[PDB]
Copies of this chain bind each other. A is one copy, B any other.
Amino acid sequence: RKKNVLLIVVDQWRADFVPHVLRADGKIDFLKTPNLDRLCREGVTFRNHVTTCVPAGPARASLLTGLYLMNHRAVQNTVPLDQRHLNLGKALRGVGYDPALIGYTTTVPDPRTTSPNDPRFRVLGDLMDGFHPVGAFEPNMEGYFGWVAQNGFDLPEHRPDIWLPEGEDAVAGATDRPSRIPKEFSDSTFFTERALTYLKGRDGKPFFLHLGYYRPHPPFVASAPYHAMYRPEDMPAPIRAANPDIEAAQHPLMKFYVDSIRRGSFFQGAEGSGATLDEAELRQMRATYCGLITEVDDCLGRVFSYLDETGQWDDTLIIFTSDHGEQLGDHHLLGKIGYNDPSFRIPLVIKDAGENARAGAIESGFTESIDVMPTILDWLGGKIPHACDGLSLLPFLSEGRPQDWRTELHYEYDFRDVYYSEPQSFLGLGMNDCSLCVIQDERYKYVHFAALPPLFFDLRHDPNEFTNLADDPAYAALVRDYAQKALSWRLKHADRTLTHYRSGPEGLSERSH
């Protein structure tokens, strides 16, 4: 009768680092996530889920509004989110739920709503208006660092230097050494302690909780013993072209990122380019990444154990997802940028209340992060806002993929200049011409740029997106077809704020179909 929602949002966790799917495909599950595996056994694992944009700001705007980037317009980190969009926090209040949130949303405020001197305009983003923060990372991670200091741990003068490899002789970069922060004071421990505090405060009352984890976001360094938990040789090999120049030749945007991404954005204090990492260094980076993932899973076990002991597990809808993926060396790239699958494909696992009709199933239907907000509101008995682009995933938990479900995946990326990454001059583009959209299915992937060449991949023969076919005249009809599907997608998703209203002889009315 009581209904809780636990929305777990990790950061930078790839869809192909989900053991349940690896085992289903007969692959070696090279990492351990027993608590995520529990959700998979009890619920539905969605194997074709994408975030509709990257990096964190855009991806979290889509997750928390149910809108594509084409509508929310929070197109990059540092770009404001218009206050007109209804977010999940405000919608939760509409159904009587407190929108409690741990972690962060990386939201720049609307300048029309606050002073231009607002300190929230000094950072990548701050908490989205409408949520109730009960465990904030805070900008500059001040919430975490203050908790570390209050726990009695002496921090270095530059606090992110806790993420340098242990030892004054250590070389910054991919490392086999632990970080300089003990496990009991890690950021994953922090968010977990906030979750337990909040759940204990609720004392059995119905809850919504957005439980955000920073890891496995970089720096790719882990508290002991997670730094040594996986052997580099057991990791999947990175997938990349023969050298960075051949890789970059595919497209100007690929060249910009191959040339510009720096190791220091991924390892604390590191020097050099991301593209020059060798296979051994990429394998070590992947092993450390897996260590950070297992630490999150260990922490989730503590949260799940509290739900078990208080008898709330079977009353709670649990949704596990990530904001976006990570290239992890694929295509000579680090991070979440561009158009490749690994930046956008993300885990999604949903466990309904009670015994799940499809417990253990793996769903191939094409799902998008914009679907999560409608799913939560549907489940709590609210109406889905008219403006949302996504649709509720609840049918997948009972009977399966609806007959009229989408037949392609869609995502977008905007690469206009921000303070730390400025491709416009290299690309020769103005700020409103720096975007792309992607449409794909089981067979083909089409990447359309507003003002650069398009790309087209045959995923059966070229699953790793190495061979652009868009300019091959033998593919003209196929490229036409996918450009046409994407164009229809644009038309179908124009803003829906008031378009159901009608004047007329009987006064104001609303159309429902």
Contacts and interface: CB of A to CB of B under 8 A. Distances in A.
Interface in A459-513: 473, 476-477, 479-480, 483-484, 486-488, 490-492, 494-505, 507-508, 511, 513
Given A73-B494, A78-B503, 8 more contacts: A94-B117, A94-B118, A117-B507, A122-B503, A125-B503, A145-B201, A145-B203, A435-B491
A82 B477 contact: no
A148 to B, nearest CB: 8
A471 to B, nearest CB: 11
Contact of A149 (B200, B437, B483, B488): B200
A454 B484 CA distance: 9
Given A114-B90, A484-B448, A487-B486, A433 B159 contact: no
Given A197-B147, A503-B123, A507-B121, A492 B78 contact: no
Interface stretch (A253-261, A315-323, A341-349, A412-420): A412-420
Contact of A79 (B111, B424, B499): B499
Interface string A96-110: 111000000000101
A96 B73 contact: no
Interface of A: 70-71, 73, 75, 78-80, 82, 84, 90, 93-98, 108, 110-111, 114-125, 133-134, 138, 142-143, 145-147, 149-150, 159, 193, 196-203, 416-419, 424, 430-433, 435-437, 448-451, 454, 473, 476-477, 479-480, 483-484, 486-488, 490-492, 494-505, 507-508, 511, 513
A505 B119 contact: no
A200 B146 contact: yes
Contacts of A71: 495
A202 B142 contact: yes
A419 B505 CA distance: 9
Among A431, A433, A490, A503, max chain B CB count under 10 A is at A503
Copies in the complex: 3
A503 B108 contact: yes
Contact of A93 (B97, B114, B125, B419): B114
A149 B202 CA distance: 11
A451 B115 contact: no
B477 A200 contact: no
A410 to B, nearest CB: 12
Among A138, A142, A500, max chain B CB count under 10 A is at A142
Contacts of A149: 197, 200-201
Nearest to A508: B121
21 contacts: A78-B503, A80-B498, A80-B501, A93-B117, A94-B118, A97-B119, A110-B498, A111-B498, A111-B501, A121-B503, A122-B505, A145-B201, A147-B197, A149-B197, A149-B201, A435-B491, A448-B487, A450-B491, A477-B480, A483-B484, A487-B490
A417 B503 contact: no
Nearest to A489: B450
Contacts of A496: 432
Contacts of A424: 513
